[PDB]
Amino acid sequence: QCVNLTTRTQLPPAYTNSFTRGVYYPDKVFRSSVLHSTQDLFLPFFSNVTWFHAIHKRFDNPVLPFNDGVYFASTEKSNIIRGWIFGTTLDSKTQSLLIVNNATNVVIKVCEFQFCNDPFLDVYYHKNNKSWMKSEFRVYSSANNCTFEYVSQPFLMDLEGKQGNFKNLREFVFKNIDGYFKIYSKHTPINLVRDLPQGFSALEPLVDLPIGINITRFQTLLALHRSSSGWTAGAAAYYVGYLQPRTFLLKYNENGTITDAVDC
Amino acid sequence: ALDPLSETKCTLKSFTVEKGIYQTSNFRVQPTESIVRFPNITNLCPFGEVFNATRFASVYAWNRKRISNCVADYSVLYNSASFSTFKCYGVSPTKLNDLCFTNVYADSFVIRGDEVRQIAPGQTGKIADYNYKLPDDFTGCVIAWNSNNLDSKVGGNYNYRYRLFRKSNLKPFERDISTEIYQAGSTPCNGVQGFNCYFPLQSYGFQPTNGVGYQPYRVVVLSFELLHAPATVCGPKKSTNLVKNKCVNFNFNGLTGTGVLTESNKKFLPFQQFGRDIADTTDAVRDPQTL
């Protein structure tokens, strides 16, 4: 809970550029074979995005300002990234949103959470019979005053440790506008070594969360494993970005999918 | 309007019609009937189970249930004739279906028959002041029915108690379970019963032979409070029949208009309900219920 890891080491925040990332479907309005100009919170093209990673001696779980909205782009092998927790104090002082995927379902709840200095979900004793089941819960000690609860459908996620190039890509958009919290999720495989590939992506809505709480900050939750201060985390990389009120030209094909975007 | 030839004279404001073609007006087809479509009523809150629960908390132990994020149908409770007395304060029963509420609190407890009259905004009495009280601005409703066929049993049921004495009157929407001995005078008590020292909680005598006036009535108090938070709970829906290939006025969700509904080969993204043209005018829509 409040016990820091043994190998955890801070690192200077390095930056890198993203190509088209941050483009999403604006609304449920359907459009085909037309060029539309949408002005909303976007990630500017060729904009510097933060460079973070988590390994068994640098473990990055910083708290970053949420502002109006943010863009997340990460790649996973063993699915190190657990989720994100949102809120002002990130403590029981007020309501805080927590999005976590436990490898069974996706838990989305708004409650008063007890803050820990190093929240995460750990596991231990793999060896033979690789296990990877939920054992220790370090996110919060207790909670109460829950104004919202949601649970997704059950599924089996593979947390087995893997080596080599990153075979997956996950790009998310988390924002709060007019007391209405929106999410955009896209999962596509890629062949990647480091940094990011160069291409275009169209993000799709995930869930609708009419919560309406103030979020000035957020923190990324990770999963730890050992074959909890001495537990480690597999190799993974995630990226954070800030959205700005930019206007893109969204080119719609005959099927309605966005082929490309142009930042004015 | 007598004949089409006369329309030319009125459009030209003259009694002589020269040889030629003249447009006297522009014809428009009016909508024959109105269309209504919405999603299902599924995923409601089980209000019937609140009053259907086997055991209810004591007047001092009354449980407070928070109901949100669902649809509420109040027509079944009013037309079921399963309630002994039903009354509302500040809101009519027929208007609840058309109103959306952010938070709905359903109170549960059991009180005496003659004690039900003390439940209302700005009331008095033992149960109102020392047990449960309604603020003057309370907008909710009251529901009660005779429990003598369930709670009351042979020999008496003492499981349901009440707070007889309190140093003052309870505040609006306040619940105090403290069992501390009540001190009438200045004589110290120290939790030991005696002179000027009494036990505040008292059990309701429940037997089937008791009078109808004192028969236990299970009361469910719904507290309607509209806060700054968004509204979720709303009344039921309609979703009338659909008509196609005809001029009609259709209203879908928060969209309205007049046009001819015709199924085309276009495919809207599962995450995109409505379409639009280059003019920002919707040329097609998706049924809120059927896909």
XYZ file of C-alpha atoms in Angstrom:
555
model
C 0.000 0.000 0.000
C 2.212 2.803 1.324
C 5.447 0.799 0.946
C 7.496 1.832 -2.077
C 9.181 -0.723 -4.318
C 12.838 -1.628 -3.877
C 13.986 -1.173 -7.482
C 11.746 1.788 -8.387
C 13.814 4.553 -9.989
C 12.635 7.875 -11.400
C 13.628 9.002 -14.887
C 13.614 12.324 -16.723
C 10.521 12.762 -18.848
C 11.544 12.143 -22.433
C 9.369 13.245 -25.350
C 8.578 11.858 -28.797
C 6.382 12.850 -31.729
C 3.109 11.256 -32.836
C 1.978 11.307 -36.445
C -1.826 11.492 -36.811
C -2.678 10.079 -33.381
C -5.659 11.573 -31.564
C -8.264 11.287 -34.349
C -11.653 9.872 -33.343
C -15.256 9.708 -34.505
C -16.797 12.965 -33.189
C -20.345 11.754 -32.503
C -22.985 9.162 -33.395
C -23.817 11.219 -36.503
C -23.172 9.131 -39.618
C -21.400 10.602 -42.647
C -20.169 8.987 -45.862
C -18.339 10.297 -48.934
C -17.974 13.805 -47.486
C -15.201 15.965 -46.032
C -16.231 17.414 -42.663
C -14.440 20.025 -40.543
C -14.681 19.179 -36.834
C -13.371 21.494 -34.104
C -12.952 19.704 -30.770
C -10.242 18.602 -28.335
C -7.598 16.801 -30.411
C -3.944 15.803 -30.236
C -2.034 18.072 -32.662
C -0.061 16.248 -35.329
C 3.706 15.963 -34.819
C 3.083 16.967 -31.197
C 5.521 15.834 -28.526
C 4.083 13.067 -26.337
C 5.637 11.888 -23.093
C 7.807 8.753 -23.075
C 7.284 6.357 -20.152
C 7.955 2.674 -19.541
C 7.865 0.122 -16.726
C 10.457 -2.615 -16.169
C 11.695 -4.801 -13.323
C 14.726 -0.973 -12.388
C 12.530 1.897 -13.617
C 8.832 1.784 -12.668
C 6.794 4.806 -13.786
C 3.519 5.532 -12.004
C 3.483 9.354 -11.848
C 0.443 11.553 -11.278
C -0.198 13.870 -14.228
C -2.703 16.718 -14.711
C -5.904 15.711 -16.487
C -6.890 19.218 -17.696
C -9.926 18.814 -20.006
C -8.764 15.606 -21.686
C -5.750 13.443 -22.440
C -4.612 10.884 -25.007
C -3.062 7.523 -24.114
C -1.114 5.297 -26.504
C 0.492 2.114 -25.198
C 1.704 -1.274 -26.404
C 1.478 -4.489 -24.403
C 2.829 -8.030 -24.372
C 2.021 -9.365 -20.886
C -0.602 -6.599 -20.400
C 1.358 -4.766 -17.698
C -0.935 -1.721 -17.789
C -3.897 -2.343 -15.487
C -5.869 0.866 -16.004
C -6.220 4.417 -14.733
C -7.672 6.189 -11.698
C -9.175 9.668 -12.063
C -10.096 12.385 -9.596
C -8.968 15.593 -7.955
C -7.344 14.337 -4.742
C -7.325 10.669 -5.844
C -8.295 9.982 -2.232
C -11.401 9.440 -0.102
C -11.682 13.224 0.382
C -14.040 13.278 -2.622
C -15.383 11.070 -5.408
C -12.807 9.437 -7.691
C -13.211 7.370 -10.858
C -11.266 4.107 -11.198
C -10.999 2.096 -14.425
C -9.285 -1.271 -13.936
C -9.207 -4.484 -15.974
C -8.528 -7.388 -13.608
C -8.163 -9.985 -16.426
C -11.723 -11.179 -15.681
C -13.911 -8.133 -16.363
C -13.581 -4.347 -16.490
C -14.486 -2.607 -13.223
C -15.656 1.015 -13.423
C -16.746 2.574 -10.127
C -17.003 6.051 -8.600
C -16.538 6.006 -4.822
C -14.396 7.530 -2.065
C -11.125 5.592 -2.254
C -8.367 5.268 0.324
C -5.225 6.538 -1.386
C -2.050 4.448 -1.401
C 1.429 5.682 -2.267
C 1.936 2.802 -4.747
C -1.384 1.352 -5.952
C -1.338 -1.721 -8.184
C -2.557 -5.304 -8.504
C 0.139 -7.846 -7.701
C 0.571 -11.584 -8.226
C 3.131 -14.122 -7.046
C 4.153 -17.776 -7.208
C 3.999 -18.585 -10.923
C 6.771 -21.147 -11.621
C 5.009 -24.177 -13.147
C 1.241 -23.770 -13.442
C 1.696 -20.207 -14.605
C -1.314 -19.014 -12.587
C -1.595 -15.227 -13.010
C -4.709 -14.756 -10.872
C -5.816 -11.863 -8.683
C -4.292 -12.162 -5.204
C -3.116 -8.926 -3.573
C -5.217 -5.768 -3.993
C -3.069 -2.678 -3.349
C -5.191 -0.068 -5.164
C -7.118 1.044 -2.072
C -7.681 -0.350 1.409
C -11.383 0.542 1.646
C -14.055 2.534 -0.165
C -17.537 3.936 0.431
C -20.091 6.491 -0.781
C -20.337 4.965 -4.245
C -22.369 7.006 -6.733
C -21.673 4.741 -9.737
C -20.880 1.088 -10.421
C -20.343 -0.737 -13.713
C -18.991 -4.158 -14.711
C -18.224 -5.365 -18.234
C -18.673 -8.883 -19.605
C -16.428 -11.713 -18.374
C -13.372 -12.687 -20.393
C -10.050 -14.494 -19.969
C -7.015 -12.241 -20.422
C -3.546 -13.741 -20.895
C -1.068 -12.175 -18.460
C 1.715 -14.681 -19.208
C 5.094 -12.992 -19.450
C 6.446 -12.682 -22.984
C 9.679 -11.497 -24.585
C 10.574 -9.903 -27.904
C 8.880 -7.219 -29.976
C 5.590 -5.613 -28.968
C 2.712 -7.364 -30.742
C -0.163 -5.111 -29.595
C -1.211 -1.462 -29.709
C -3.829 0.255 -27.538
C -4.790 3.909 -28.060
C -7.271 5.582 -25.706
C -8.830 9.026 -25.302
C -10.040 10.059 -21.837
C -11.820 13.403 -21.482
C -14.568 15.120 -19.485
C -16.832 17.710 -21.134
C -19.966 19.313 -19.671
C -19.997 16.861 -16.777
C -20.146 13.981 -19.278
C -17.143 11.647 -19.392
C -16.331 10.022 -22.742
C -13.980 7.196 -23.740
C -12.515 6.094 -27.079
C -10.806 2.717 -27.453
C -9.019 1.039 -30.364
C -7.126 -2.265 -30.172
C -4.998 -3.301 -33.156
C -1.893 -5.514 -33.419
C 1.410 -4.120 -34.681
C 5.048 -5.117 -35.136
C 7.051 -2.634 -33.066
C 10.466 -2.454 -31.401
C 10.549 0.959 -29.708
C 8.983 4.408 -30.183
C 5.797 4.053 -32.301
C 4.815 3.044 -35.844
C 3.880 5.616 -38.475
C 0.268 5.333 -39.599
C -3.312 6.480 -39.165
C -5.990 5.220 -36.777
C -9.684 5.949 -36.195
C -10.759 5.662 -32.557
C -14.200 4.332 -31.631
C -16.352 4.909 -28.525
C -16.092 2.342 -25.739
C -18.650 3.201 -23.023
C -20.781 6.170 -21.972
C -20.153 7.392 -18.408
C -22.488 10.355 -17.500
C -20.634 10.775 -14.207
C -20.050 14.525 -13.955
C -17.285 14.777 -11.355
C -14.279 17.087 -11.445
C -11.025 15.439 -12.550
C -7.872 17.564 -12.335
C -5.375 14.670 -12.250
C -4.881 11.003 -13.082
C -2.518 8.113 -12.376
C -1.705 4.973 -14.358
C -2.117 1.655 -12.531
C 0.175 -1.250 -13.417
C 0.315 -4.960 -12.629
C 3.188 -6.508 -10.672
C 4.355 -10.115 -10.681
C 6.925 -12.379 -9.050
C 8.009 -15.948 -9.784
C 4.841 -6.586 -2.298
C 7.789 -4.187 -2.103
C 10.084 -6.730 -3.780
C 7.723 -7.563 -6.650
C 8.608 -6.483 -10.185
C 6.758 -5.631 -13.397
C 7.322 -6.871 -16.928
C 8.539 -4.773 -19.828
C 5.894 -2.354 -21.105
C 5.593 1.150 -22.527
C 2.790 3.708 -22.418
C 2.485 7.307 -23.583
C 0.531 10.334 -22.356
C -0.604 13.431 -24.231
C -2.741 16.534 -23.875
C -5.667 17.449 -26.114
C -6.092 20.928 -27.586
C -8.994 22.626 -29.399
C -7.823 21.891 -32.947
C -9.788 21.576 -36.189
C -9.304 18.499 -38.377
C -10.677 17.780 -41.844
C -12.201 14.303 -41.536
C -12.352 12.460 -44.866
C -15.178 9.906 -44.892
C -15.068 6.994 -47.334
C -18.065 5.255 -48.914
C -18.384 2.974 -45.866
C -18.143 5.863 -43.380
C -14.663 5.096 -42.033
C -12.178 7.945 -41.650
C -9.304 7.476 -44.097
C -7.156 10.448 -43.036
C -7.257 13.709 -41.093
C -5.686 17.102 -41.800
C -4.781 19.516 -38.995
C -5.536 23.071 -40.117
C -60.481 28.227 -54.147
C -63.570 27.439 -56.250
C -61.711 26.317 -59.384
C -58.091 26.363 -60.583
C -58.882 29.048 -63.168
C -60.063 31.369 -60.389
C -56.743 30.887 -58.579
C -54.997 32.625 -61.486
C -57.183 35.720 -61.099
C -56.501 35.875 -57.355
C -52.755 35.314 -57.793
C -52.558 38.048 -60.448
C -55.048 40.336 -58.640
C -56.963 40.806 -61.905
C -60.245 39.599 -63.388
C -58.712 38.906 -66.827
C -56.455 35.878 -67.344
C -54.113 36.159 -70.317
C -53.197 33.104 -72.366
C -50.242 31.297 -70.834
C -49.031 29.179 -67.936
C -49.256 30.701 -64.453
C -48.248 29.257 -61.076
C -50.955 30.188 -58.570
C -49.499 28.349 -55.550
C -47.165 25.578 -54.377
C -48.753 22.300 -53.298
C -47.443 20.458 -50.237
C -48.488 17.057 -48.895
C -49.404 17.169 -45.211
C -48.486 14.338 -42.813
C -51.247 11.755 -42.476
C -50.372 10.539 -38.966
C -47.641 10.903 -36.351
C -45.084 8.157 -35.708
C -43.498 7.362 -32.343
C -40.537 5.064 -31.680
C -38.234 4.549 -28.691
C -36.069 1.843 -27.056
C -37.294 -0.902 -24.729
C -38.219 -0.575 -21.048
C -35.724 -3.280 -20.052
C -33.264 -2.939 -17.157
C -35.513 -1.291 -14.591
C -35.181 -0.949 -10.821
C -37.137 -3.617 -8.908
C -39.453 -1.288 -6.997
C -41.913 -4.125 -6.411
C -39.278 -6.038 -4.451
C -38.787 -3.107 -2.052
C -42.283 -3.517 -0.595
C -42.160 -7.262 -1.359
C -39.138 -7.790 0.915
C -39.822 -10.347 3.634
C -38.586 -8.282 6.595
C -38.465 -4.501 6.992
C -36.364 -2.445 9.380
C -37.754 -0.970 12.583
C -39.043 2.603 12.688
C -35.708 3.551 14.257
C -33.831 1.021 12.087
C -35.456 2.112 8.809
C -33.238 1.345 5.825
C -32.593 3.936 3.114
C -32.287 2.550 -0.419
C -30.679 4.636 -3.171
C -32.305 4.082 -6.577
C -30.686 5.580 -9.673
C -29.837 4.822 -13.306
C -32.977 3.007 -14.430
C -36.525 3.610 -15.671
C -39.465 3.806 -13.262
C -43.050 2.768 -14.033
C -45.461 4.101 -11.408
C -48.659 3.086 -13.229
C -48.351 -0.513 -12.013
C -48.204 0.508 -8.342
C -51.206 2.846 -8.558
C -53.396 0.533 -10.665
C -52.446 -2.646 -8.770
C -54.798 -1.848 -5.848
C -52.264 -3.501 -3.513
C -51.836 -0.393 -1.324
C -54.046 0.616 1.593
C -53.366 4.356 1.249
C -51.441 6.297 -1.398
C -50.758 10.033 -1.275
C -48.152 12.437 -2.644
C -46.869 15.863 -1.610
C -45.925 18.552 -4.118
C -46.114 16.234 -7.150
C -49.097 14.504 -8.735
C -48.997 10.750 -9.435
C -49.845 11.165 -13.126
C -46.967 13.630 -13.634
C -44.280 11.296 -12.252
C -44.129 9.362 -15.530
C -43.224 12.534 -17.456
C -40.574 13.700 -14.951
C -36.950 12.573 -14.679
C -35.386 12.492 -11.207
C -31.689 12.332 -10.361
C -31.975 10.490 -7.025
C -34.857 8.454 -5.587
C -34.686 7.274 -1.966
C -37.202 4.602 -0.922
C -37.749 4.484 2.836
C -38.855 1.254 4.506
C -40.231 0.678 8.005
C -43.309 -0.462 9.936
C -45.495 1.796 12.093
C -48.885 1.669 13.778
C -52.046 2.440 11.844
C -52.862 5.600 13.784
C -49.190 6.592 13.431
C -49.364 6.825 9.626
C -51.259 10.123 9.891
C -48.160 11.723 11.453
C -46.099 11.204 8.270
C -46.189 14.426 6.235
C -44.393 17.775 5.823
C -44.332 19.669 9.103
C -46.001 17.022 11.262
C -45.780 16.209 14.973
C -46.275 13.300 17.362
C -44.119 10.547 18.789
C -43.216 8.710 15.578
C -42.737 11.932 13.602
C -40.465 13.797 16.024
C -38.709 10.894 17.765
C -38.555 8.444 14.837
C -39.084 9.717 11.282
C -40.053 13.189 10.057
C -40.832 14.716 6.664
C -39.411 18.147 5.778
C -41.851 20.827 4.682
C -40.331 20.748 1.178
C -40.535 16.952 0.819
C -41.736 16.224 -2.723
C -42.045 12.443 -2.375
C -45.020 10.150 -1.875
C -46.336 7.837 0.847
C -47.442 4.207 0.530
C -48.847 1.874 3.180
C -50.700 -1.434 3.374
C -51.897 -3.711 6.159
C -49.194 -6.151 7.292
C -51.392 -7.941 9.853
C -51.339 -11.019 7.589
C -47.523 -11.248 7.707
C -45.776 -9.326 10.490
C -48.396 -9.950 13.178
C -48.313 -13.519 14.496
C -49.762 -15.491 17.391
C -48.118 -14.578 20.685
C -46.885 -11.194 19.470
C -43.841 -10.014 17.520
C -41.387 -7.785 19.399
C -38.813 -7.625 16.584
C -40.217 -4.226 15.514
C -39.476 -1.531 18.107
C -39.507 2.263 18.280
C -37.870 5.151 20.128
C -40.321 6.402 22.753
C -38.235 9.173 24.357
C -35.592 11.564 23.053
C -34.008 14.705 24.474
C -35.290 16.665 21.452
C -37.021 16.299 18.082
C -35.209 14.576 15.229
C -34.048 16.690 12.304
C -35.357 16.172 8.759
C -34.036 12.928 7.265
C -32.132 11.938 10.411
C -31.708 8.407 11.773
C -30.354 7.781 15.283
C -29.974 4.178 16.468
C -28.353 5.150 19.784
C -29.659 2.924 22.586
C -28.321 5.191 25.353
C -30.663 5.333 28.336
C -32.988 8.339 28.433
C -32.608 10.642 31.447
C -35.880 12.339 32.377
C -34.544 14.408 35.275
C -31.168 15.330 36.724
C -30.719 11.988 38.498
C -27.697 10.170 37.015
C -28.431 6.944 35.146
C -25.139 5.402 33.936
C -26.943 2.808 31.820
C -28.690 1.307 34.870
C -32.481 1.458 34.767
C -34.126 3.087 37.759
C -35.844 6.223 38.989
C -35.942 8.858 36.224
C -34.093 6.410 33.950
C -35.867 4.548 31.146
C -35.070 2.529 28.034
C -36.100 4.531 24.948
C -36.732 1.641 22.551
C -40.151 -0.014 22.816
C -41.564 -2.983 20.911
C -44.766 -2.789 18.876
C -47.321 -5.340 20.035
C -48.323 -7.372 16.965
C -51.094 -9.979 17.071
C -53.833 -10.817 14.545
C -56.544 -10.120 17.150
C -55.588 -6.440 17.458
C -57.865 -3.743 16.103
C -57.586 -2.605 12.507
C -56.502 0.849 13.666
C -53.434 -0.511 15.464
C -52.680 -3.203 12.880
C -49.088 -2.845 11.618
C -48.782 -1.105 8.255
C -45.656 -1.411 6.119
C -44.825 2.064 4.786
C -42.507 2.809 1.855
C -41.480 6.473 1.641
C -39.921 7.601 -1.646
C -37.828 10.779 -1.386
C -37.664 12.685 -4.685
C -34.700 15.083 -4.715
C -33.436 16.930 -7.799
C -29.783 17.918 -7.392
C -27.263 19.573 -9.703
C -26.168 16.131 -10.915
C -27.546 14.820 -14.221
C -30.921 13.088 -14.266
C -31.233 9.370 -14.989
C -34.415 7.775 -13.639
C -37.311 8.619 -15.956
C -40.835 7.436 -16.607
C -41.775 4.652 -19.016
C -41.732 4.822 -22.824
C -44.272 4.404 -25.630
C -42.735 3.035 -28.875
C -45.842 2.988 -31.040
C -46.180 1.209 -34.375
C -44.029 2.196 -37.352
C -45.244 3.248 -40.806
C -43.237 3.406 -44.033
C -43.732 4.761 -47.554
C -46.102 7.470 -46.315
C -46.003 11.132 -45.329
C -45.976 11.347 -41.521
C -44.511 13.361 -38.646
C -41.984 11.171 -36.823
C -40.249 11.830 -33.496
C -37.248 9.623 -32.666
C -35.584 10.165 -29.267
C -34.791 13.908 -29.207
C -35.184 14.296 -32.972
C -38.357 15.376 -34.764
C -39.400 16.111 -38.318
C -41.657 15.224 -41.220
C -40.732 12.886 -44.052
C -41.191 9.510 -45.705
C -39.514 6.581 -43.945
C -37.962 4.135 -46.420
C -35.419 1.391 -45.769
C -32.264 1.839 -47.855
C -29.057 -0.133 -48.387
C -26.895 2.328 -46.436
C -25.200 0.931 -43.327
C -24.771 3.132 -40.266
C -21.869 2.359 -37.967
C -23.062 0.496 -34.843
C -21.669 3.444 -32.859
C -23.449 6.001 -35.093
C -27.232 6.206 -34.730
C -28.164 9.101 -37.040
C -26.999 10.226 -40.470
C -26.619 13.665 -42.023
C -26.075 15.184 -45.460
C -23.753 17.969 -46.621
C -26.475 20.440 -45.586
C -26.571 19.129 -41.984
C -30.065 17.739 -42.643
C -30.644 14.142 -41.580
C -31.600 11.973 -44.561
C -31.959 8.752 -42.539
C -32.308 7.534 -38.956
C -31.970 4.292 -37.002
C -34.885 2.881 -35.031
C -34.156 3.484 -31.316
C -35.581 0.010 -30.612
C -35.085 -2.278 -33.606
C -31.856 -2.186 -35.615
